[PDB]
Design an enzyme around this catalytic site. Structure first.
Site: not given
Length: 461
Positions: A1-2
């Site tokens: 995830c970012t």
């Protein structure tokens, strides 16, 4: 995830933005866009993964969410906006270390990413309240994961990081700042008695009394509770670096592996939704680390990109300030690898969601936007340089159409006697156009791509 966070003075339009790529383990895992009305919300919640059992208040608020179609591992709602215009995204998996885990181990029957939006978002009326409720729940039930969680309302943006089985800390992002956060603990310099921080009542004592602080002066939470590993230099830090280079080019050096990039940043300009989507779709464009680029095989595969095959959904949760509250909450949404999709600005103030975004199942269905978007990005991946021009045209064309619909819808909001019905119609128009344009893109790629198949032999006449 970012994750990318933007304070209300840092955005181009005075809105707050919190966003995340919801990246999973498998490349594909069907996602749905679902409004949970109060009557549909559990009062007695039990998780699938940990079997944690949580009694919930009897007054949940309506909220948007992005649950998994296949419920084998639980709901996994990911993110949403409630009827108080509070946004929440959970989670960004972060890092920890053995010293703090030795003191406060994970709780195997505790809370996880499976659960967090469901047990927090419906019950709070501000971002700050979201932080406090989550903190209480971590203390009451524990957690079995290291997580980062974003909260926002029309005034404030907060980032909370969980620490061991029960502890936590949170920072209010300055109005004029932004944050880019990868899968690594992020909070750095930390002032315990500050108006801009919240944490476990015992956090400082935990640090001081157990010799957890590696620094000679002051408190840096990720120095204390997080990681600075070799894996961080390739999996995490380059993503932070690429984002900061995009927003703060003159404040950011040229080492993607840097372990002490700032948490809080100040861009050289105001930030648009388009900007956020660009960074959340990126793969180190114009560097040797771009997997679609000119670098060596080893350089091309060294870093984890931000746009990636296992982007299951991308959401940009926007609380606007230039409009009446009934249209302030925008749940921007797309599915599949971010290289070949566009975020669509769904109004969050609705009781139901458009069919092309709501109806994915485990059965492959190209009438559904999850499957259609994944199919597009996979084809695009097979010859990026060949398809990128159509991709680029589509992005401008689609986003232009979405904004036209949003602008028209916003302009006629006054005097609407049924707001939810009005906005559901607008969301239907948005989804219909999004599907038509996604489909036309794939068709154009298939048509031109078919000309370029290996299995060909043309007479050049």
């Amino acid at each position: 995830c970012t994750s990318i966070l933007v304070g209300k003075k840092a955005s181009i339009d005075g809105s707050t933005l919190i966003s995340r790529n919801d990246d999973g383990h498998e490349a594909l895992d069907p996602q749905r866009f679902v409004v949970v009305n109060p009557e549909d919300q559990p009062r007695d919640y039990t998780s699938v993964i940990s079997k944690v059992n949580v009694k919930l208040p009897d007054d949940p608020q309506r909220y948007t969410s992005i649950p998994n179609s296949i419920l084998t591992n639980g709901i996994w709602p990911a993110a949403g906006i409630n009827s108080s215009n509070v946004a929440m995204s959970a989670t960004e998996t972060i890092t920890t270390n053995s010293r703090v885990q030795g003191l406060d181990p994970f709780v195997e029957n505790g809370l996880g990413e499976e659960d967090l939006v469901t047990v927090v978002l419906p019950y709070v009326k501000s971002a700050r309240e979201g932080v406090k409720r989550l903190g209480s729940l971590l203390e009451e039930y524990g957690t079995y994961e290291p997580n980062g969680i974003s909260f926002a309302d029309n005034e404030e943006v907060w980032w909370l990081e969980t620490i061991g089985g029960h502890h936590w800390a949170a920072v209010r992002i300055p109005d004029d700042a932004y944050v880019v956060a990868p899968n690594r603990m992020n909070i750095d310099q930390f002032d315990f008695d500050s108006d801009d921080t919240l944490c476990s009542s015992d956090l400082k004592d935990l640090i001081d009394n157990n010799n957890l602080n590696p620094d000679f002066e002051n408190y840096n939470l990720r120095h204390i509770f997080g990681s600075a590993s070799i894996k961080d230099t390739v999996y995490n830090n380059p993503r932070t670096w690429y984002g900061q280079k995009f927003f703060s080019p003159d404040d950011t050096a040229d080492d993607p592996m840097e372990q002490d990039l700032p948490f809080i940043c100040h861009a050289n300009r105001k930030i648009s939704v388009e900007d956020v989507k660009f960074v959340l779709s990126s793969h180190f464009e114009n560097t040797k680390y771009d997997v679609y680029g000119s670098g060596s095989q080893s350089d091309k595969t060294l870093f984890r990109p931000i746009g990636i095959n296992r982007n299951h959904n991308v959401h940009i949760l926007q609380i606007r300030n230039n409009v009446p509250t009934e249209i302030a909450g925008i749940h921007w949404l797309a599915y599949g690898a971010n290289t070949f999709n566009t975020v669509v600005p769904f109004y969050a103030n609705v009781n139901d969601t458009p069919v092309q975004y709501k109806n994915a199942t485990g059965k492959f269905d190209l009438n559904n936007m999850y499957w259609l978007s994944c199919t597009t990005a996979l084809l695009g991946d097979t010859d990026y340089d060949f398809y990128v021009d159509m991709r680029n045209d589509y992005e401008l064309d689609a986003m232009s159409a979405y904004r036209k619909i949003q602008n028209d819808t916003d302009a006629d909001i006054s005097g609407q006697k049924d707001i939810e019905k009005y906005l559901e119609n607008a969301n239907k128009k948005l989804a219909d156009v999004a599907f038509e344009k996604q489909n036309k893109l794939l068709g154009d790629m298939v048509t031109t791509g078919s000309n370029n198949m290996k299995l060909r032999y043309n007479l050049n006449d």
